[PDB]
């Protein structure tokens, strides 16, 4: 159970957007592809569906007629599109899948659209290195500065994901500068920093950057 | 028409192990074609129930589900960590689909006293121009917490912001960084930069620094 949704995107205003939302699995079968909004923050508003089957679509009043769905039955992929696009469109969208053994039986990751007139720019990693002002009993801290990047999202993650216990990625910050910063933190043992190799790895997809940073002592 | 989901409470607060239930009111009769879910701190979203009481088969027995008239209720018997996170209701007898306001999950655990530790700027960044000094309250509770910043002894005021994570999935407890911007220049003139926290679980303030001169280390 995992939807696949494509990924995060920086739009400027006035300008339209289109998402898609497949399935892991060739699936098939009568299915129905329900969307959702979410504003940073806020709760959930359903958009509204496609049915692959016949075609048929059905929207919330909310949109004006701002989102259209479409499918395309070879591949099992849904799309919303929303035009003229205002900061009002800036949020996280999400695709369900009901009707076939279920009520909304897998979602999607969610996709991050950014509605502004800034223009990308990939982030600066800095390491937060291990040292005895952050080392307590056998164990210390280390980590990545995520400096000057936009829009959201960055994502990271360590060793290639192989370490998540103690991991400690906060929220990003909007500088004065209009970009945004964050940092992510691990405890490792004191002792493995001689042998272990410990390496972020970061992405912003946005702007097509990928960087993995080995953090030495 | 419209059918409004009307969810209860809007925040909720309990103890690990506790049982806790959240509730969602159908102005009109939706059948038990009520759906139940959580959103995780990173955005997953996950079926929990559907058709009022029918469990996900892949959510735990905690996890249950309930109807008495026009009230829904989901219920999580003994609360873990890993539960912490924003949870909604949404009906889907008819169209336009509605979701309740939702209700955020806190956590309450015992005391903890956060482990403090303090970065100087890397050299890259200083290559750069800038200089972010970064301080870190590690795994605490309660939320709490007061950072103040001294450079040669000197309080400072204006230049740092602090970010707090979502409670901790493993054990519900916080992390905070409190960053410390500067232009190299400026960190180039001072020498010491110190960290003063004060939180309920510390007997006294802790107070972290390190010497620029001496580099990170002991050099």
């Known amino acids: 159970v995992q939807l696949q949704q494509s990924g995060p995107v920086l739009v400027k205003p006035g300008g339209s957007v289109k998402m898609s939302c497949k399935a892991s699995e060739y699936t098939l079968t009568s299915y129905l592809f329900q969307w959702v909004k979410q504003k940073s923050g806020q709760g959930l508003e359903w958009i509204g569906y496609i049915y692959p089957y016949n075609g048929g679509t059905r929207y919330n009043e909310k949109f004006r007629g701002k989102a259209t769905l479409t499918s395309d039955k070879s591949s099992n992929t849904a799309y919303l599109e929303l035009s003229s696009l205002t900061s009002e469109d800036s949020a996280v969208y999400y695709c369900?899948?009901?009707?076939?053994?279920?009520?909304?039986?897998?979602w999607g990751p969610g996709t991050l659209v950014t509605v502004s007139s800034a223009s990308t720019k990939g982030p600066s990693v800095f390491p937060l290195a291990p040292s005895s002002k952050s080392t307590s009993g056998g164990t210390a801290a280390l980590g990545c500065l995520v400096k000057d990047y936009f829009p959201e999202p960055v994502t990271v993650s360590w060793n290639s994901g192989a370490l998540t216990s103690g991991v400690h990625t906060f929220p990003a910050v909007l500088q004065s500068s209009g970009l945004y910063s964050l940092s992510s933190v691990v405890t490792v043992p004191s002792s493995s920093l001689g042998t272990q190799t410990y390496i972020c790895n970061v992405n912003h997809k946005p702007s097509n950057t990928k960087v993995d940073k080995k953090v030495e002592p | 028409l419209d059918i409004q989901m009307t969810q209860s409470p809007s925040s909720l607060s309990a103890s690990l192990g506790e049982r806790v239930s959240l509730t969602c009111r159908a102005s009109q009769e939706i059948s038990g074609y009520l759906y139940w879910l959580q959103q995780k701190p990173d955005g997953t979203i996950k079926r929990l129930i559907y058709a009022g009481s029918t469990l996900d088969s892949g959510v735990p027995k905690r996890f249950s589900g309930s109807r008495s008239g026009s009230d829904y209720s989901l219920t999580i018997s003994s609360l873990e960590s890993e539960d912490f996170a924003d949870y909604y209701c949404?009906?889907?007898?008819?169209?336009?689909?509605?979701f309740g306001g939702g209700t955020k999950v806190e956590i309450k655990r015992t005391v903890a006293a956060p482990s403090v530790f303090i970065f100087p700027p890397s050299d890259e960044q200083l290559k750069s121009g800038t200089a972010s000094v970064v301080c870190l309250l590690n795994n605490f509770y309660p939320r709490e917490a007061k950072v103040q910043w001294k450079v040669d002894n000197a309080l400072q005021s204006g230049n740092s912001q602090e970010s707090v994570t979502e409670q901790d999935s493993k054990d519900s407890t916080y992390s905070l960084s409190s960053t410390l911007t500067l232009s190299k220049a400026d960190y180039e003139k001072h020498k010491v930069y110190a960290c003063e926290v004060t939180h309920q679980g510390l007997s006294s303030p802790v107070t972290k620094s390190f010497n620029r001169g001496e580099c990170g280390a002991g050099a």
């Open positions: 949404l009906q889907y007898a008819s169209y336009p689909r509605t």
């Open positions: 369900a899948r009901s009707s076939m053994s279920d009520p909304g039986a897998n």
